[PDB]
Design a protein around this ligand. Sequence first.
Ligand SMILES: [Zn+2]
Lengths: 209, 298, 98, 215, 78
Amino acid sequence: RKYKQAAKCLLLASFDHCDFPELLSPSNVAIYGGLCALATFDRQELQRNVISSSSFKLFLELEPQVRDIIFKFYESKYASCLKMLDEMKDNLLLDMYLAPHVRTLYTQIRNRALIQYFSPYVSADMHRMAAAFNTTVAALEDELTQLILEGLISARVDSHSKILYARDVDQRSTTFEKSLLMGKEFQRRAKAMMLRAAVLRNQIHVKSP
Amino acid sequence: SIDEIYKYDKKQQQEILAAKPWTKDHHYFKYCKISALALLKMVMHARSGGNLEVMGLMLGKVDGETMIIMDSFALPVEGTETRVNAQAAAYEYMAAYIENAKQVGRLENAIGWYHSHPGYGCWLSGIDVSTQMLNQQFQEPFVAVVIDPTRTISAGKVNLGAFRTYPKGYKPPDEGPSEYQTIPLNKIEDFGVHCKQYYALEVSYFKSSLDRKLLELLWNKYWVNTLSSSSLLTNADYTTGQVFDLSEKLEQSEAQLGRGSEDKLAKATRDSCKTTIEAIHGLMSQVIKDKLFNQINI
Amino acid sequence: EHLIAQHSAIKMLHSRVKLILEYVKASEAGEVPFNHEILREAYALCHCLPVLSTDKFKTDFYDQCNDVGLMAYLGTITKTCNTMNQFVNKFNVLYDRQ
Amino acid sequence: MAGEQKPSSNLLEQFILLAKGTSGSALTALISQVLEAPGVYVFGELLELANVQELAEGANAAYLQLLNLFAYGTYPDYIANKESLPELSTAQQNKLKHLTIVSLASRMKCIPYSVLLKDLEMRNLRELEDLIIEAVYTDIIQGKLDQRNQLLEVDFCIGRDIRKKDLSAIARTLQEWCVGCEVVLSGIEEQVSRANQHKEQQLGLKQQIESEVAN
Amino acid sequence: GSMLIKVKTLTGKEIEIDIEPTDKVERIKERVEEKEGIPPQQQRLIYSGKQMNDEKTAADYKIMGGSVLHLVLALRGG
Ligand SMILES: [Zn+2]
């Protein structure tokens, strides 16, 4: 599950080996590799890995499906992208080896679908966007609520807006509050250790009985 | 007289110059009477030198038991702190200067080594400890005149030390200061190789009454400049470099006190308190100006 | 040893604008020339009063002093942590075999 | 002739010799050519001459009214006192507007636009900032247009007039506040001669203690 | 200076200087500029078609009395 070096090799597909029936079906070869990547990557080097993929280009050209899948994925047609995503749900299941990580994959998939589109905006409107992702308004916002559980933007929603506003502005005052929290626990520890010097140097302990 | 010490008795001065008390005791020179030419271009040519190390000839003399620095300063050069006997190459300066300095009655002769480690001192490093030791077996009376430019920038005091190094054969007796100083990686090892081979001179300063009146009158219109510093903007980045350096020094104090450079934790606490004091006093002066001129309400 | 350069320059110009003050006072007093360019500048001055009320620098100086003060807070750290390390030393000295 | 902040430099001995030799109606012509002198709209040592003293309270007593207006009054005074003073040109009427407005910015850090719109009878933005930019264009005004505060940013003011006399009280209030900030800062000075002089003594003695701790 | 070498400009300005047999040409530069206003960093010290390291000893290149320390140097100083 350290799929970083996994895709590091997946990109490394060298057709000129040209034969091993136990190796992988080139359908599975490309889908396997590139989707380990599509989990692992950050977009830039991977587009490099993808748009500027040369050694994999046959492996590239194997599945036109997954090819334009990840293409317009990074181009963000999330609707049909996710569509064929959880359509090959069943067939990755049909992979013995795609089955064991379907949850992992689809998890990080819709995660990074978020990560992809959400980053530029400032206030997450949902209406047309939900029309895209094809998640019900509640299911949409609860996806979002999930997102709240971990998300990166100091963001809030008028539900009646049916729309987020994303992360806030200041980090300075943030530093301020962490600073004061710092200082308070500092003084706390400090008295603690004063009293600790007392208890030690005052011989203090607890017997066993 | 206040001018009694400005009197350069070339007779008396060059007499004690040829006196060779150091060959009888290499600890004879305890004092270092200085005229502020050392401070003058030592300071502003270590600072104007950026970070470029320098070298050369100091004006001066000797009086009683005293080396005397009439001059010390910097070059627009480099290489010092790593040069094989750097300082020599700038002596051409008063290869000429002092000569026709005698043409104005500056009948002085060459006495020492001007220099500066812009940003990190004025001294002689490992290769310059070859310099320092070799030359004090070459050139005694010789001194490691030591003041740090950026230390004197963020410090507010001139840590001057005339370091007659203990020549080979002569160990530090009772009085060897050996000013331990945080050295870069280049020369810290060789300082540990030679940290206890020098002592300091009791560096006093001599002047005229006109000198004091001039400095007071300097202040008497510089105070306007005093309330126009804006130096928290100046080296806040310097404070940041100290940020990194200090977290690093706490890393290294960690690594030292782990199992078993002496007590880097205590030294680090010391230097941290120091540099924080530095930034805080900068903020002091700046808040001073601020609250003053901004609490002027109509 | 710093602020006395402040003190010196301020006292120098203080003598300057105080001689100013003195021959000024004489202007309104008597037997010393009546000019309209004397105080007038003083009016300019009293409208030169505390520059930047602005709240701009107000926030700015919250910034400055908070920076230096949290610096000093960390240094409450530096001081008492050095003290703490020496305490743990001597705790490993007599309570323990350091 | 002489040169610092003032109107057209001819004016000093110009109107000296004029009031000296031009009087009554010649004095009126004197005054008419006095009228355009911006930085000296007030003639304290120029009304020093009895020729201007008869300029004043003579036929041109209304003009001494106007002169004191320059010294004391404002253009909005004329907006009320439309008949008291002598005639003025639209240029010079705007000049008295600039009187009161430079006095205002002299008062505030930045005077509001509506302030001079109303007191100086200024109707709209266009003419408003026209006379504004011409005032600043005189270079009396530093700073810039304080639009957001609806003010005029002010960094420097050249002296408008000679502004007959709070002069004594002016300079002595100056002495007052100068000494007041001085004494605030000097109490600070000796608190400093306390504290980190106290810091010298305290740490010196504490270090004496620490040194004597050994043996 | 025990070693009395020559620092020579491009036009042939050979200057007599007292240095040591381990005296740094790093400080020999300092010497040439403290003596002649021509600063040393365009006093590019080249030894036999190949540069002398600015951070070296003169005697590192078997430099001696009549030896040459190349400037190429400047004209305004001189
Ligand atoms: Zn060396």
